[PDB]
Design a protein around this nucleic acid. Structure first.
Lengths: 234, 77, 65, 86, 94
RNA sequence: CAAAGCCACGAUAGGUCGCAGUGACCAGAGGGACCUGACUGUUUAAUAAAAACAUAGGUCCCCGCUAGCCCGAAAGGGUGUG
RNA sequence: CCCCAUGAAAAGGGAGUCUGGAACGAUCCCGGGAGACCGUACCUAGAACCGACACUGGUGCCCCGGUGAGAAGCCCAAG
């Protein structure tokens, strides 16, 4: 047979790369080591990211972008560090917060920029404490474990209700993926030939075998439901 | 070498007593000077494609006159 | 059909109804949190709003402030 | 407030930051000011109430004092250099 | 507060709006000033600066210029009120 | 505004000729019933334009990031300025 | 007014605020000098390009009085 589409998508040709030069910049925390203060100077649109970003100016003259928090205005003053209080937009440390506090853009280590709860409308809560680490419940309902001194922002990422309006036509979804790396439109595998897909071929379009496949299948075969524990709607 | 928007077409015959018609190509108009975060160009400041070498003709006569009005300034002194 | 009458007879009655209820929430008369309902608030992009009197810009939801 | 002899700072204009002394009151919108010996020497002119910002320093002179009368009074309180201290 | 404000506007003399009452404050010809909490910041700290030069009472209203305008009965907002004549009310002790 | 000179459009009254007045030119035949794909779009360059492909809507599976899925002989890499 | 589209970057320009240095001195008037190097003819298409051809194909882009809604169909200027 021939290489599948997902196998071509891994060579990273220009058809499958992200057009990142169109974004404001990486939206990460900077490496700072004090108790500073900042001012929001702008709220911008980041093309293919789903959440608006804020631009922050530190008292020592440092510029950086972080995902915007719902309810933060331009010209507002925020504090960064271990002594920061519990207010929207403040960058705090997770070791200092009580139980059930809603945060976002949570780091795993000290100084990685933020990993979890970054997409629009998402947030995390503080759910306990291990010996050396705090337990945080993510939006997937799973639990992750992070350092004592990992930074996070207080509040919820702006842009909720994003998905309550139907796109309503094939062209509204044509722009959406012009600024992203996602391949669109998507051809069903049953509509291909046997040389291009394990589902292709036959008089009647059908998945010829059960769709569930094991975790040990070689590349070029992991299609359908991957290592599923269950199927069906209920 | 056909049309390009980075040039405006002009044709001249009103103030005109000779008799012919042609077309002149000039570059689009400039704007008051640029980078951006504070975003307000000014009142009394001059921008021309060439420079008449002017000095006080292209700027007001206040303290920060050419820089900006008293808006984005007093946190600088 | 209200605001959704610009689609004609396409996309299905229930799909047009959901689109129309979201847009009718966006175009409600909103009140500015900072000054008051004095100047009306408008959307710049998804999650970005400002009031046209006080010129204050803030971050909110996708279709409401 | 705005009274006789208050030291003020002009917020706009050509000098816009240099100091002056209020000598008398013209009407509800204008007062007469002077700076005798400024770096450019702001001259005796009227000024709008909205164009000057008051300071806490005052000078004891009478209404409509001349240019010399205020010049001595500045020396009396030793404010000749102390204009540019705030 | 509303009890005195009802009597103040019934008999006293009052000034509505920032520009007219800001000039009187600089020359010290207002008995007192009430400021709503939604006023522009540049004008609010101008009121506070010029007030310390003359010892004039300043009252900080909790609401906005709209429910301050509605208390005066005026169809639109008023953010600053200048009290030039108490009349017969008992508001000036605040 | 009203007068004057130019100009445009919409109407009114009367007279009149032909076989025929949107006189050439330009310029939709209409209606009833069933199947099929919802729709706008795409396709076998050179015998197939379709009921085939796509689509919006629906639903299921993997994965907390040193992940999941994929490329490489290795150094490493695409998704990821996520 | 619209977007689950938010719609390039630099050289090169101008201005501002400060620091240091000299007392001579222009972003204004008058006179004088200099400004390498390389392209430039012609066609640009029912005969100058590609298709074995002076090939009804393809490669072109920009522009142009009456009737009439009209860059349509019909008739005619300049050419």
């Amino acid at each position: 047979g021939k290489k599948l589409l997902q196998q071509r998508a891994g060579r990273g040709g220009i058809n499958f790369r992200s057009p990142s030069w169109r974004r404001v910049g990486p939206a990460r925390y900077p490496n700072i080591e004090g108790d500073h203060k900042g001012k929001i100077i702008d709220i911008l649109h980041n093309p293919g990211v789903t959440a608006p970003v804020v631009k922050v100016k530190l008292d020592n003259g440092l510029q950086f972008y972080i995902p915007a928090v719902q309810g933060v205005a331009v010209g507002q003053e925020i504090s960064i560090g271990k002594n920061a209080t519990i207010s929207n937009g403040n960058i705090v440390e997770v070791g200092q917060l009580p139980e059930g506090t809603v945060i976002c853009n949570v780091e795993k280590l000290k100084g990685d920029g933020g990993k979890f709860a970054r997409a629009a409308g998402s947030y995390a809560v503080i759910s306990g404490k291990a010996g050396n680490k705090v337990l945080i419940k993510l939006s997937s309902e799973k639990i992750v474990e992070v350092s004592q001194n990992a930074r996070a922002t207080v509040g919820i990422i702006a842009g909720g209700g994003f998905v309550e309006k139907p796109l309503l036509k094939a062209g509204n979804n044509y722009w959406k993926y012009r600024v992203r790396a996602v391949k669109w439109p998507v051809v069903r595998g049953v509509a291909m030939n046997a040389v291009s897909h394990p589902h292709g071929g036959g008089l009647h379009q059908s998945v010829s075998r059960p769709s569930t496949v094991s975790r040990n299948a070689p590349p070029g075969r992991k299609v359908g439901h991957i290592a599923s524990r269950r199927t069906g709607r209920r | 070498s056909p049309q390009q928007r980075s040039g405006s077409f002009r044709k001249v015959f009103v103030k005109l007593p000779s008799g012919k018609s042609t077309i002149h190509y000039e570059r689009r108009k400039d704007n008051i000077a640029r980078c951006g975060m504070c975003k307000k160009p000014l009142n009394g400041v001059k921008n021309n494609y060439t420079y008449k070498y002017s000095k006080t003709e292209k700027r007001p006569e206040r303290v920060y006159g050419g820089y900006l009005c008293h808006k984005c300034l007093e946190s600088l002194i | 059909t209200g605001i959704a009458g610009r689609f004609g007879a396409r996309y299905g009655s229930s799909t047009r109804k959901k689109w129309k209820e979201v847009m009718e929430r966006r175009y409600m008369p909103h009140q500015c949190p900072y000054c008051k309902t004095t100047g009306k608030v408008v959307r710049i992009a998804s999650g970005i709003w400002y009031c046209r009197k006080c010129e204050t810009k803030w971050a909110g939801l996708a279709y409401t402030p | 407030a705005i009274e006789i002899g208050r030291i003020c700072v002009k917020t706009r204009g050509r000098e816009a930051g240099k100091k002056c002394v209020i000598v008398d009151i013209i009407d509800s919108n204008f007062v007469l000011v002077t700076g005798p010996k400024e770096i450019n020497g702001v001259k005796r002119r009227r000024v709008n109430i909205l164009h000057i910002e008051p300071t806490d320093k005052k000078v004891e002179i009478n209404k409509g004092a001349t240019d010399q009368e205020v010049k001595q009074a500045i020396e009396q309180s030793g404010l000749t250099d102390f204009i540019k201290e705030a | 507060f509303e009890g005195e404000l009802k009597t103040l506007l019934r008999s006293g003399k009052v000034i509505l709006g920032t520009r007219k009452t800001l000039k009187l404050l600089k020359t010290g010809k207002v008995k007192g000033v009430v400021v709503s909490s939604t006023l522009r910041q540049d004008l609010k700290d101008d009121i506070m600066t010029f007030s310390k030069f003359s010892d004039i009472p300043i009252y900080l209203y909790k609401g906005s210029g709209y429910e301050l305008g509605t208390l005066c009965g005026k169809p639109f907002m008023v953010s600053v009120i200048g009290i030039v004549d108490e009349g017969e009310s008992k508001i000036l002790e605040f």
